[PDB]
Amino acid sequence: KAFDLVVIGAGSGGLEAGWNAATLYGKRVAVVDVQTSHGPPFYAALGGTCVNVGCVPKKLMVTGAQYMDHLRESAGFGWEFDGSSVKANWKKLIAAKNEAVLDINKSYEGMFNDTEGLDFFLGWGSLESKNVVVVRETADPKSAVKERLQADHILLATGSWPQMPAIPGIEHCISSNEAFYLPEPPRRVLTVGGGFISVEFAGIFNAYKPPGGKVTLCYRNNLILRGFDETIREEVTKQLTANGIEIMTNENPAKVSLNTDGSKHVTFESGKTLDVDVVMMAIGRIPRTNDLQLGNVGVKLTPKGGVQVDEFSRTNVPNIYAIGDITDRLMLTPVAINEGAALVDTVFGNKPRKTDHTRVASAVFSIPPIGTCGLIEEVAAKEFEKVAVYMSSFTPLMHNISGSKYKKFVAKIVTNHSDGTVLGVHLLGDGAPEIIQAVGVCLRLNAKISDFYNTIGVHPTSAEELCSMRTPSYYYVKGEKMEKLP
Template sequence: MSLRGGTRSLQGAAEGAKSAHGFDYDYFVIGGGSGGVRSSRIAASHGAKVALVESVRLGGTCVNVGCVPKKLMVYGSHYPHDLEDAKAYGWDMTEPKLNWQRMIENKNKEIARLNGIYERMLKNAGVEVIQGRGTLVDKHTVDVDGKKYTADKILVAVGGWPSLPKIPGIEHAITSNEAFFLKERPQRVIVVGGGYIAIEFAGIFNGYGSQVTQLYRGDLWLRGFDKDVREHLVNEYKEQGVDVRFNSNIAKIEKSGDGLKATLEDGSVLDADVIMYATGRSPRTKDLGCEKVGVELDKNGAIVVNEGFQTSVENIYAVGDVINRIQLTPVALAEGHCLADTLFGGKPRKTDYSDVPTAVFSQPSIGTVGLTEEQAREKYGEVHIYKTSFRAMKHTLTGRQEKTFMKLIVHPETDKVLGVHMVGDAAGEIIQLAGVCMKAGATKADFDNTIGVHPTSAEEFVTLRTRFGA
């Protein structure tokens, strides 16, 4: 799928008028993902002469092998349940038949469409797009497949890449990158990991009809999320038939007939057609030239930056997953935008990392913003907890036992809402507006004084009255 194969400019040539500083460009961006595209486009809108280099496809992880295709596959995995639920509402459906290849082809067409939009957007903004692999030569020079380009300021926005453990047979496993291009739906899948990527893919494969076993080496998945949320989702996945196993890990993988055999650390064996690892991502700084030019890296290979995204080399900057702060597409967009405004727009500003709303497109989905109960108690001591668990109205007819969970964490003295958490249908949609409330400093009284939209699940957030514990 790589477009690599020599340097190719999509808009004009690198030669021509120098920038105001005597370099080829004012701003040279390495990486065409969310942060790099946004920063280059905004910088160009401020009048800077900008180039962006990308070695694969524009849009980065999110567009190509991340949130966009994953969300499309989440949508697709819901249909078998939806068709089954339709019977309770009077609809008799024929037995559904899956054409996995058609789904993959349609997904690929949509991603190609988005790649084109990114290319046109950059071109219209006046950014020169160069195809190839960019590496740092010195503080003002980038090498792209043998050709040198100079710039007054350089931005590194190369993102991250899935990492794999070093165990025997790991070459037989895949990551989320390859999961988007499987030629057929696997019958038996082992998903290794307990983060949001692992959980989302376990839900996707399960929804599409695969037999799914999910292994996590810890006691409970989704480390860093509210404990009630984590435990609630475990119960939901088990109810749906996902074989969730904690304190479990693979010791080795072997070929077995037309499938794979995974031997666990406890000696037990699992058979699978696909073994997918989602056990972390690493910054893509290997062979980028950071060490050669003096750009400091942390122990995990992430680029160290100050609050203005400046590296240890004063004119080289970095944003997005490569700096290992909050690895979310909207965060990278905000970082890139702030940096461009600061450097070229005469509008110095910083990225605010507080109360960032986020969603996990598990099944059911998670929406969360603000502090977890554990974080709130550590910071404030006593906090007020309001929570509820209920079967959504839709399932009073379908008979499904799926439960929605909602939780508010409130400061006992100021009444300010410190955290909002939800597991249930449309949690990602609902949490966006909860994030607005948090940014505005909403109190529990503000929630209580808001009239609910009935009948919806969301109205539960403004009708919570029972307090749990201190």
């Protein structure tokens, strides 16, 4: 019952820290999670949110959703078939996703069996004391102890959970957790929220809806995807609309009731109403701190609710660290993994390393998708006296032939115009998530715009647009947008 490291949460960050500590530094590791495989009741399980009810199944389902566009687009290239015979079998998709997620769950079980020092414990981890984690039967702190784990080092890696707004009839609504297990594809669905999860699910439901279906996405403010490039926010909005999704901006559910046929009657704050089969809330995710009983050792939380951490993932309590979504910063898997890898290389490697929270590449698997790294221009413009924006936006040739004329590719480079340093790169279109990864490496290397334009293009690709931009489209001078410099 004695460990160098006890990790609460067998997720993206938890397993990276766990595995590394064991395989690289031959350390003695305990990892706690509430479930060994995906789905109800606790949804996240061994592997974490990403594996079970996040990046992995979502990406399989977006890939499934993309075939609605490929089947149509094929016609431009001479593919002929009976379009009246086309059906999207959601039940197939969910069964194939479940098998793929289960195989990963089994994979992690394999990893824990086949690794000296690395041991998995089932149940609910909380903090007894500075150096003891208790595993109980349930999330109730009164439930039975299954284990008392002695820890020289404790890692909090419990991730996040969907926020459900406290409106009348919220019990008629689901989150992404339940979206992954719907037995039938909804004919009419309201996705609530303007972030990546609402956007990605609107695309998924749009592809799998039965005949006479309608996807509506509502967002409480004016323009979806706050924090992304503004040109891309506007374009994603147009491209989702072009593919049949209704975007209701400046709208927010005030209440939901069940109609007598089991459908949902949504009343908006504005007084508008909408009948749907599913209401999926995707308005936020909040760190999972309640169940850890952090009051028992006095781990400090932020005004927001995340575990407060320094640059080395250290809480206010020596030997207690926190990575990933529990810190309520950038809620992405590779960030959690990076923080985990750094924490272990630091503490057990004697090789201190801090995660860089700048210049993080990320994606939205919207149809079509977003790839982005670094600052949007409005943010750059407040930090840098002179910012240049390089922009290329056009419908690629393939999509003129496919008939998807609305699929404008957007490539934007934001620079410090004083030295040419690239501050951010913002892509919308097929392949954007793949294109952006090596751009993340470019930004780590302090690439300038001249490093891009002096590189020889790969032709023909969308990516070569990033190496063809020599002249700013416009600038910000002391925060002020203008076409030309003074």
